[PDB]
Design a protein around this ligand. Sequence first.
Ligand SMILES: [Zn+2]
Ligand SMILES: [Zn+2]
Ligand SMILES: [Zn+2]
Ligand SMILES: [Zn+2]
Lengths: 55, 171, 162, 227, 131
Amino acid sequence: AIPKYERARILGTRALQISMNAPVFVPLRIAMKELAEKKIPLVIRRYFEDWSVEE
Amino acid sequence: MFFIKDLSLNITLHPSFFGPRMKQYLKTKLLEEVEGSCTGKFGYILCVLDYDNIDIQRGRILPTDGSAEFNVKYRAVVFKPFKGEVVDGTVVSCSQHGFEVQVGPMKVFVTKHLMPQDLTFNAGSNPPSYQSSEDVITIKSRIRVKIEGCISQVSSIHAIGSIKEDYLGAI
Amino acid sequence: RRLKEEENAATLQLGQEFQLKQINHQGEEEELIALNLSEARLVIKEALVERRRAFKRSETREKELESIDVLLEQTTGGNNKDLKNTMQYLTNFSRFRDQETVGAVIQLLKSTGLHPFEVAQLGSLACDTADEAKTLIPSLNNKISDDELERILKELSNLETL
Amino acid sequence: YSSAPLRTVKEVQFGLFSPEEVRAISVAPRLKCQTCQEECPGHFGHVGFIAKIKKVCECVCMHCGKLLCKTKMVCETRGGCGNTQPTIRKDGLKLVGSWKKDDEPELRVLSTEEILNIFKHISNEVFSRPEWPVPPPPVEHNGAPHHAIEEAESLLQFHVATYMPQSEETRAELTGALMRCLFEAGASAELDDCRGVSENVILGQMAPIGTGAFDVMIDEESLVKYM
Amino acid sequence: NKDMCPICKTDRYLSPDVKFLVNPECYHRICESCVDRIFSLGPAQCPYKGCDKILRKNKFKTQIFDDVEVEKEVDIRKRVFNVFNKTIDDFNGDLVEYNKYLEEVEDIIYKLDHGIDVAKTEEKLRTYEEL
Ligand SMILES: [Zn+2]
Ligand SMILES: [Zn+2]
Ligand SMILES: [Zn+2]
Ligand SMILES: [Zn+2]
């Protein structure tokens, strides 16, 4: 863990979560809206470096 | 035998719990899934110590499932039976083949061939019991047993007990 | 590069996951923690009361058994049958009730230097003579003299409650 | 449903069966399945290395199994027996050794038993050894002159040789032995890291390309602040 | 009974690793393999014709003196000497009393070995130990 395509997977990953009755903090349209407002609570672990979707 | 063991577990959370309080659900899942479970590698995981200090590492979202996998490290008291160990328990069931002795969360089965020749099965007494000139073994009778063998499955443990050796049997 | 000793309590061959030397979550080497029935009973109940306290924030055998049963139901979830049997078994088979009695027992037996498994048996099984202990616990053979074991057993019965 | 943990294949360690393992793996209707009463994967029961075998025989002495290489025609008795190694040639499905005199050279056939004994005497140690399973349904005692036994062995060897988007994820989206293709991999106990696209495609797991070149974790630091 | 187990007839030539042990109860030679097979599970009758004494597994021990009779005398003497412990000083220099005391102890050991008065001798031995 180093001290401190992605869009497609994040949108699909959160779209599946929303379809499974996950809480919405703002299914593909909802995920896109969350990404626009930076409300997707996931971190991309680039292979490693962890990068928050918000930042 | 009772032990304190440092264990790890892979809990999975449905996306419905991806809220600001998902850590609380992980503690509930850890208690509701581990406590009372019989892991043959570690024995009967009985209780979880330091319930406010469980380590919850960053979760990983599965590709297609959509759930998040969490690696959880916790401290729990685990009961692991070993062959050649001496235990005490209360008989719960009696039958022609043998009787079962309850030791903690485990049951120990004593077959006819593992009992002294003096003891003889008798169904005349209600409930059925094993009678011998010196004493009678039946349900609720305290018995000291020696585990002669254990078959630890993935999620199940069974043992066979013996009372033929000296200083064993009824207390 | 990995491919294919049966466990035996008498030979102190407890397997792979219960070796004498253990590694905790902090990476520090530690001695295997084996608990006698009295010690195990205290550990389980002490954790339960602490867990109950956290939830709220956010004696004769019969009364203690009932008190344990009510506490167990309140502070445990589903599939708790195994723990219910354990607490009932522990309360009806322990030898030391109070923490002070357990503490003295640990201090007494820690000077023997035996394996953690053997000391747990000594505090869990009641014996009258060193011969009974030796046959019930084969691992004690050729490790402790009969005179040393005889005094330990007599002292252990001295601190036994009631 | 299975209680065992669900994992992903991270490595494929090719090797070779030992005779002990084949007997140990074998379960024998035993191949509803009578063995598991099931979902059943298939239970096992109980020619491509001829060039490799010939090379090994030439590279080592055929009496003591000590390393000599092919051109060498003497044990160089260092520990050794001093026998002159033969010239091995492949005829059909058999190996023939020829010794040159000190006047046609002496010729004989190296029996498979002799080759096996020498190989066992040769000094991967775990997964593939020079000395080294009926597929499941889904996939000399008396008389017997040498001529009869040889014919039967040849027939058996010949027979053996002859025998040998439906999800929201996809909706939104829209060098290893296995990668090259295997006998050589097993002989050398080749370890396949399954880091290539071909290996993951074969094993049906997400490849580390495009959307799979990273891992999507879940962060609790942001979750608490989102309410 | 020369170099093999009377029960399983295992010769030393075929199994050189074989060893023998004797239980102080009836001083009957038996190989360790038979001991593990029979007495490991629990106490059982000695496997000799005409012998029915119950002997435990733990009590088995190696034989030191080749003569079996001498082994019995020493072990009995060991038991007696544990109960009977005295020195010349204990009698305050009375050599005659010390010599008489030693003679009585030897008589007790001899009686135990031959079992002439085992019942009375054992009772007397128990009384002194308690006292
Ligand atoms: Zn099957
Ligand atoms: Zn050679
Ligand atoms: Zn024998
Ligand atoms: Zn005998």
